[PDB]
């Protein structure tokens, strides 16, 4: 029925839980800058993600170099926008790259094509 | 050095869709859904996500309201909205999805309800 305008609704409670940490259950640091977040939701976006926490796995280390790209992945991931830039497309794509998401990796590839 | 604002307006409805397929097989599920006794998985923030209600009850994980919901009438299809947003109206049951998601303060479901009044 409605289901756009529904799922639109919920994407953007997920993301003001985030904003204020309600219900988060999985935490990182990357490069010195702490984020909090739903394993559910980064499972429905990224396979690294879905694998890892399946199989009833926490987050330690994380494998990228990038805060700044991280966070703009995970805004994307609860807000559905992206914002490259020739200053932060390299940072973004190696973020996605480790996080396999090819949805990202087509659009910062996209974006050096110019 | 051009600069690039996306939109992505498919991705709200794939990660409802994909949080919906995690219900189903029963992955990343930490709270219980209870209709007629029978516990249904789900997950504690999108139950949040769509009512005020649940926000409070998992928040607080506490009922600030005292009251047993597990026998209300309508419930039934609450779930199925939430991580759907498909609903089975019919004049015999609109007066008590009505009262049920007045109670949870779902607005979604309080609209199509009064669509059945508007006919």
């Given at each position: 029925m409605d289901f756009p305008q529904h799922s639109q609704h919920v994407l953007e409670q997920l993301n003001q839980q985030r904003q204020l940490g309600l219900l988060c259950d999985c935490t990182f640091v990357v490069d010195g800058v702490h984020f909090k977040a739903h394993k559910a939701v980064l499972a429905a976006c990224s396979e690294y993600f879905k694998m890892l926490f399946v199989d009833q796995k926490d987050v330690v280390?994380?494998?990228?170099?990038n805060a700044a790209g991280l966070g703009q992945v995970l805004e994307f991931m609860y807000t559905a926008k992206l914002s490259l830039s020739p200053e932060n497309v390299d940072d973004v794509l190696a973020v996605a790259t480790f996080l396999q998401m090819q949805d990202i990796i087509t659009a910062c590839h996209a974006l050096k094509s110019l």
């Open positions: 280390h994380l494998d990228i170099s």
